[PDB]
Design a protein around this ligand. Sequence first.
Ligand SMILES: Nc1ncnc2c1ncn2[C@@H]1O[C@H](COP(=O)(O)OP(=O)(O)O)[C@@H](O)[C@H]1O
Ligand SMILES: Nc1ncnc2c1ncn2[C@@H]1O[C@H](COP(=O)(O)OP(=O)(O)O)[C@@H](O)[C@H]1O
Ligand SMILES: [Mg+2]
Lengths: 306, 356, 617
Amino acid sequence: TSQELIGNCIISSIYETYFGHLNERERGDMLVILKRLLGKFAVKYDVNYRFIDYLVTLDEKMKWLECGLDKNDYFLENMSIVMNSQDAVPFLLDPSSHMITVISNYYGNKTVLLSFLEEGFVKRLENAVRFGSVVIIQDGEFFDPIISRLISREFNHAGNRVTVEIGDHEVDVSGDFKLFIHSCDPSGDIPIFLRSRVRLVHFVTNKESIETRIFDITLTEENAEMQRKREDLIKLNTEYRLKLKNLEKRLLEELNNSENDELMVTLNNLKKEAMNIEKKLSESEEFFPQFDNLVEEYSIIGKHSV
Amino acid sequence: VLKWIPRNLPSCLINVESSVTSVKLHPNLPIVFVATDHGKLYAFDLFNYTIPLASLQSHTKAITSMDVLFTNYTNSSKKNYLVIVTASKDLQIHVFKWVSEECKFQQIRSLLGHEHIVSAVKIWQKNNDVHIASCSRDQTVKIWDFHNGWSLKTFQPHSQWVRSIDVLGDYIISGSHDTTLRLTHWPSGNGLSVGTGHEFPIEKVKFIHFIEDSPEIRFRTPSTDRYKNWGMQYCVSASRDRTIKIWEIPLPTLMAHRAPIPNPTDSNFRCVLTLKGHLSWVRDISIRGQYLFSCADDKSVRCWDLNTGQCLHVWEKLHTGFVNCLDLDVDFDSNVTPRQMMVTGGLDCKSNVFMR
Amino acid sequence: EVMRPDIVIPTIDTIKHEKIFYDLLNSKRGIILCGPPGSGKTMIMNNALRNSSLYDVVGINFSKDTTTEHILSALHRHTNYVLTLLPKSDIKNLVLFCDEINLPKLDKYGSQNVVLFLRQLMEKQGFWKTPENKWVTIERIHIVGACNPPTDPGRIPMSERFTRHAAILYLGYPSGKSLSQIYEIYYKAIFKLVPEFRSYTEPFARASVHLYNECKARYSTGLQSHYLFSPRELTRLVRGVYTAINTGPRQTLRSLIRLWAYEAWRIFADRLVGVKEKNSFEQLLYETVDKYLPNQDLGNISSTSLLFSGLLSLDFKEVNKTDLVNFIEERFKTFCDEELEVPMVIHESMVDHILRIDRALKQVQGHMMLIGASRTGKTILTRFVAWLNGLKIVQPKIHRHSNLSDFDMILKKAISDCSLKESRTCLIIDESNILETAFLERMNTLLANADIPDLFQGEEYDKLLNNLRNKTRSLGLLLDTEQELYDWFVGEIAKNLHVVFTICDPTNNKSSAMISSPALFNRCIINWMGDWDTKTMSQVANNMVDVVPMEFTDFIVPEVNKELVFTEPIQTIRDAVVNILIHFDRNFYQKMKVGVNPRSPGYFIDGLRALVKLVTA
Ligand SMILES: Nc1ncnc2c1ncn2[C@@H]1O[C@H](COP(=O)(O)OP(=O)(O)O)[C@@H](O)[C@H]1O
Ligand SMILES: Nc1ncnc2c1ncn2[C@@H]1O[C@H](COP(=O)(O)OP(=O)(O)O)[C@@H](O)[C@H]1O
Ligand SMILES: [Mg+2]
């Protein structure tokens, strides 16, 4: 797993920047050509790689699901591609405008709604960047170039405090400030200056997403117990791995030295947990071919639907 | 003996981990202090340069300027020690005390009040009273006293940020980033005159002091009885326009036992002499005898003359990169012995010293 | 004297045209000069009238927004009223200049106004005064014109009712022999500076004329819309060679040829768009030098092998690449310390472009246009080079809810700072900074002329004249008439103001109209930033990835084709990462059907930053 990490980092980093504004089919095709291209240049990647299972832990995944995001994997990886931008200001493009509520839930009361069409926009914006509150912007198709310094992050380190120039006067910023842009027009013309400096993420629904959602509905209604078993086994496998790691930490802390019953009990618990891990892996090994058969069996319904 | 010229080759070599920003001289014993960019403060001996005498971290950011003074307190209880003040980019300056017996640094006090990075510091003594002057990017030329450690006067000479200052008596000259100079009265704060004529920001400025006896100097001797009574004759400035200009000080509306006032018809500097030939920005200047020494960013240091006004000697390729600072010994004060060495520092993490 | 723009070289064609033009003016007939934009109609026009003792010149420049008030103001400065209108001169008949007659726009009902006014003046021999309703009689005032053919995209065809009364002439491009003689005289004048190479006047004139001929013949307007070559480019080449030689060191023949090749690179091929087109230009330069100059010891004369700078010394001489890169890196670190901080990486192409922008900016009345994709480093490079030369950045902060008013204020403030306060300014204009075509017409007026008279009228004009008189008296110059003050002011503006344009997407209609404008395309130097070639991307990736350790796995060297590897031949894993990223970027841009649109490389920098962060974690 360590002769393999640099291939897995490049497939994940390239997933963040280039795949923002592509749908399911183009993402699949480009991921396939990336895997073939990595194979051409002899860098080992993961044949069983999944972007969500590589970067989206179960805790953040559940926290994002409870906020209001749909259970589709595409929206999950797009929420990941948005929230994992520490350097470039992200662009949110959803005609439904459904995830303003989601980001409000994630950031709590700190979420402050603003719009480019407001007249007191600049004053409350400089106030918000002064206190460092998270800012949500609507109607990005009418981008105002007065925030060009914020968009490209052309700050200057004046002393120990970071400083930006907005409007016609010096203003101060704080490290807890984050900015988001939401738009409602999928075909709204955007300046190339804004487009090339943001992370254009498309929260739209095409025919390929129709096929994916039809397949999801068929799995969650036709055979729902097997999908529930998948979710339960994934959760218990993660919990069992965490408990095994905690038991090993207990064993290593039981070195003592400024054998005993506590150390032997810890070793027996580790033995039971490792046996449980082995049994869970053996049971899960013969469970994914059921998914393969279900995919090969529920594709005509998707083709007819599209 | 005052007409000494360093030879064509460096006497010794000094290696530092990072780039050199300031090189000074101990005015009594052969010890060279070398600044860094990582904030480290070094201490080298001329005859033993392999191993530093002391190494200390006192600033989080880069150190820009240094100053070294030896006190002359009239009382025997206050012994004569060495004070080293280093100004850095960490919004703070630190003051060191050198000890001869233990050969180690000791921080005395740190002076705060700057709103931005400080670029220059100068130390002086008029009559049994040590003062520390500094100028920063916040356009505030601040003055401190050593014993109290409190500010005395804060003022802006220029709208754009000041870079380098020099002190003499009750008068402070200050270069700036708005390609102009302005003298200020130290106690009152009134700008006596404003100099203009450079086409680029000023790097370093120092006064040209008088001399007691010399055959013929046309740029250090007094001109009239008014200037003899005043005590300053010329000032020299260096700026990023590849030139060094020596300027006269205009007369103020001076009155006995009163603050000087600017002359409405004579409150403007006059460019006297200019020197050209440097391939890049002149970075630092130092005057000794009748010879004006200046470094530049052309990997070279040049030796100019006050009287005839051209380069007698040149030293190409002194370093791999830019040459940052030069310093000499004070010749106009009888307390400081004008002994013969030259010290330079480069951006290529190397330093060089000149002996004999 | 080659720097001043009022000079000609008398060949057969220009004297022939001057003779027939005196005949046509003396025949009481209007004259229209129609020809290609580089034929020098204005040049020969001003040469014919300025040297004349029988006619006078009045300066009018038509624009899209032009009314008869400008014509009335211009004629009022040279004529008098007695109802009869007569010129101030009693012997010389006034001749009324009208260049770019196609430039005034049609009304709401398909007609123009100023051309009909001129027609009424030249065939009804007068006009009706508007407020007093009186007839005007005009006796010895003639009308001349200079307009391009209407085939180019932006010229409005003119009604035959006006061209009825005016004679028409075609000023074709001068042939090979005439250009050879003219530039022979130019090179004799320019080589009077270095008498040691006086015998090389003829081969250089032949080489310049021939190279211009083939550069016109190969790259036509079909490939790109801005390949409008003209002898103006050759004249500007002569000016560049002069401004290099006059501020250069002791000169040798090899350095002479290298200097000429560098000027040719920076004036003919900087607007080329294709790599194969640049290779064709390089082959053309090779064969031209070989054909007309059998000289040996001539090294590589590509763009990256010809670096002439004034920063590294006191004169315009060739500099070593490594010393140049080190100096640029240290100066840029100082720039980021003193100014806005941006993690810019140094590569050879950016050094080449920063030097060509520095060459453009040091010229008097020097203006340039930058064409390239976004996030290619254009405005930061312009600010950096302006800080190098001591210029002042005046960046117009234009928002959405803007109009002509605030743009007029920022232009007026920039002009006042340039003239009154005597501070050089490097004005930058982005593509998004031009909302409507009115700002474009304001730029046309600013650049085609030396100033904008519309910004100073009435009380503004009076206070501007008062401030100009105050500045002139403060400087100590005996100037009292308004004409001398105005000419000194426009000279100060033309000497101390440089505009640099930033254009992101040239395929847009607004960008197409902006680069198709005649008063903007000819004066500015066209530079094509374009997209990064493979070598530049490889250099940037090698300079960005090496900060984090990659070597912890055994790597086998894969045998692949030579054309598939863009980095230097692979031996480690960092080169594998560089190759994999460049290959993915190229395949992604090919499979998105971007077409001939510029490919913004900001995706590559973002991918590299995310890569280094993720591999560190
Ligand atoms: N016969 C000639 N003699 C000297 N220079 C010429 C001649 N013909 C053309 N030129 C050059 O060509 C350029 C044409 O520029 P310009 O007069 O602006 O063209 P136009 O009048 O078409 O706008 C001039 O700079 C001039 O130096
Ligand atoms: N090697 C590079 N060359 C050019 N630009 C770069 C490079 N690396 C990063 N950049 C990014 O490009 C931006 C500057 O480009 P800029 O000139 O503003 O583009 P534009 O002219 O389209 O506005 C910087 O914010 C920087 O983050
Ligand atoms: Mg023309």
